[PDB]
Amino acid sequence: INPKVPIQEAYAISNSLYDLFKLHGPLSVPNTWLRAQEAGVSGLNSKTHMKLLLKWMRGKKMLKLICNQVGSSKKFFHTVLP
Amino acid sequence: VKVRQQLNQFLKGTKHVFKWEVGDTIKKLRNRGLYYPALKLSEVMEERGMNKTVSDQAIHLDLVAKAREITAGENYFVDLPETSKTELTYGSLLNCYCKELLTEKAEGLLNKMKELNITPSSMSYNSLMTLYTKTGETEKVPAMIQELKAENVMPDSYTYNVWMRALAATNDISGVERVIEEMNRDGRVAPDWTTYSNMASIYVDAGLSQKAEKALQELEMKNTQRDFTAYQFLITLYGRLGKLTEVYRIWRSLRLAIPKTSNVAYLNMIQVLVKLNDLPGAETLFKEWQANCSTYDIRIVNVLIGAYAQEGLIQKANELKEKAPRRGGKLNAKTWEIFMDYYVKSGDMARALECMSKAVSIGKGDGGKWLPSPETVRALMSYFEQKKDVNGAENLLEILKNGTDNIGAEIFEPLIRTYAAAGKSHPAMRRRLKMENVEVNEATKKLLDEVS
RNA sequence: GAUCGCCUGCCAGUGGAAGGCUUUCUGCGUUCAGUCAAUCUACGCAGAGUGAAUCGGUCCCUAAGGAACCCCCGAAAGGGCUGCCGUCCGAUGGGUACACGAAAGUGACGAAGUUGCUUUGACUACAAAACCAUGCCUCUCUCUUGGAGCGAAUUGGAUGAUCGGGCCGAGGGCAGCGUAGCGCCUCUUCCCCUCACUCUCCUUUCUCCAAUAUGAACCUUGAGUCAUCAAAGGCGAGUCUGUUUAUAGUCGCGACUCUUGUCAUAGUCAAGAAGGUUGAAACUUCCAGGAAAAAACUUCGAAUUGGGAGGGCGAUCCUCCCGGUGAACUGACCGUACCCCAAACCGACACAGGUGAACAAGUAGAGUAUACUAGGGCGCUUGAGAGAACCAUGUCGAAGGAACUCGGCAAAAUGACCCCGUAACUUCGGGAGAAGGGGUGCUCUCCUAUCUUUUGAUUAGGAAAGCGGCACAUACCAGGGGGUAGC
């Protein structure tokens, strides 16, 4: 993929988020912002920037979006990429 | 070798293989010496996967070269686009010249580079120094070492070890020790067991570095459980101090590797065990070995067969000899020669003759040849003519010379005098003494003139 | 030199045949040509330029054909005759190795499937986690240290009270986990004895959807190494086991199992490394039934230097048969520049005309259709202003819808793919894309297929939920249809 991201700090921040994920669990749906605010890091500034880094990571193959839909309700999970 | 069959059936295959697998296969076959298939691969999988690094270009250059194709090596080199002619290529040229013994072109190219302001690395300097240590001008290395110091290079463990082999040639054992201390003086080693085994390779002169040999052992036992790089530079020191326990212990601590351990291991140790002359231990070890039956072909029969033949134990040597091809492979030319060695030492004329000539003209040639190289002819004659028998002249020439002239008539400074003063049995060879032409002595030229 | 453009499956590119015949290049010049003022050139002067056993010709053959001879015929000329046993003729076949003289050939449509319709690599810095280390309690190669419960005995069961039996406690590394951490290919050298191959993503964007490299795939032929079975009915070696022999034990072996060739002999040959060479064509379907050549090639027929015999007794310098009989140097001549959809060819011209083939990167597209590009080539050898009538070629035009006019000429419109459905008539093949309608975007999910281009996802189809636009074959590309006469 090819979204925006700062150039090199991105690697540190991605390893930060990957740590967070593999500790916590693939439940980290958006509003993962809460998890990454409590195991907190200041290498983010906003929810939109958060999801942008999430996309960048999953492109680099550090994260993976997955499906778990229940009933007729769409839920989606960022696994920490086994 | 079956390597060729594996790769050759592979080439017409599928699941196109990664450059990593390929490079690893190179680094494997080069180590095991298989220049031929390593090159053939790095050619065909280049035809298919072309772009190779500049480093991989250097690797291919070394393969082409050390395919004993130095000519094609240099040609390919000047084929390389000058863009791909960096330090790595020049260094491969050098480290090829190391073996190639071409000091002249080597030094020319060396100064060429030096003017070109493209620095040579450690291994470059070091290949050079080994070329020195074989060219005999081994004393020439420390001046270039001073240049190296002026050129900001760290001469590695290998440089220290060829220093040891260079200051051994001039009997500077204090120089060996001061190199040994220069090791720890600078934090640039990080020395390995090559350091200590190169110490031993010269200190097998007296025997005053046994704790350093134990240090060899412990650095070894770090880098490995125990791997085969403690057993080629150690067999005579395996006859050195510790001859009972430090060797009967290392043998089993090595077998702690627990394969049906190699013919090479047994052939590094059995000649030492016969050096110590513990024949029952040698015999037990041989018998458990052929219980292992794991490719003894000659590498285990020849040695203690030779020990039997050396003693005079020829019935025991002979039974085993004519047993070994009942079950398995061949026997070596020098396996015939040790037998001839006993036959000679015991003087038996016709049988020693037969076995020798068989050995020389049978397909057991070592390196495409089995000229019996040592001057055993000087004894062979002293048993033909100097047995004080009159046909130690006729058969002397017609068989001794007929055996020793399948390779070249050069060695014949004993032989020609030998017949000239073997006749001396009966003079009927003035007809011969023209064809006796190349070079003959002047004192024995009187023996010659005597016939006519 | 630089921004900007135009072309990229017949006006602009690449190699060129036909044609041109110095138009190519180098210097000098601008009298002539150029649709200018020309320092410029396809212009004048001056000079140089084209290398080829293999290309293309030469050459061998023949087709269409034109003639030669003989023959036949005709006032003269000449016409007729190719068999009367010859010579010319390429847009065909034969190109590299002799010539001479016979059997095989050379050798043959169309259409349609099936081939040709190229694929690789792209970063284990450097390569993965058993060994035994280690950091641990656990535990008895082995004990050893006193305690404490637990049978022992009677004489014929209600007793009587102590050694053969015996069960947890303090110390010692051995048989159970976790704890740092870390590399297990073979030199079959015949001899090791000190050595160099060690030259890559752990740090990266830009495979953020590209840059660099490749261009056939299969028999058919000859000559050096193992493994053959032709070269013989010929063995050790560990398992499995009969008991004791003791210089101390290995002694013995009945019987079973397990691999495994030699003594030479040659006898066929499987597995790597060198040379021409099928692919460049195959198979089916048909009916209009699909070139020639002693030319080359493949054999014999003969061969004439090389051999060995020729019985050599014909001096016969010959006789019978075996051996090669085009093989190494060599490989002449002529074309070779330049343009070859054009300013150099045919068109009187530096003219929107005409001029066979061969090759042609990407995106979307079935498409060589069509847009837009890179590469390559070109900016059309008149321009600078103003932005009237007028004309050419185009975009839009309300309301109206053929009222125009000879005539809906032109212009407009419809168009694509998928699905729905489709009339009269009939020669029953067709009308038929009959007419008449709907759908077309993207997003995620699901399942389906499929796909080895590895890692499970990607691309297309079809389900069903959104989401935006007036509009989703959005630009380019792309049928107006129906009814009824005459011929």
UniProtKB/Swiss-Prot annotation, chain B:
Task: Tell me the domain of life.
Answer: Eukaryota
Family assignment? Belongs to the PPR family. P subfamily.
Major localization class? mitochondrion
Mind telling me which SUPFAM superfamilies this protein's record contains?
TPR-like
Q: Name one Pfam family in it.
A: PPR
Keyword list, A-Z: Mitochondrion, Repeat, Ribonucleoprotein, Ribosomal protein
Q: Protein name, please?
A: Large ribosomal subunit protein mL101 (rPPR4)
Quaternary data = Component of the mitochondrial ribosome large subunit.
**PPR repeat positions:** 86-120, 121-155, 156-190, 192-226, 227-257, 262-292, 297-331, 332-366
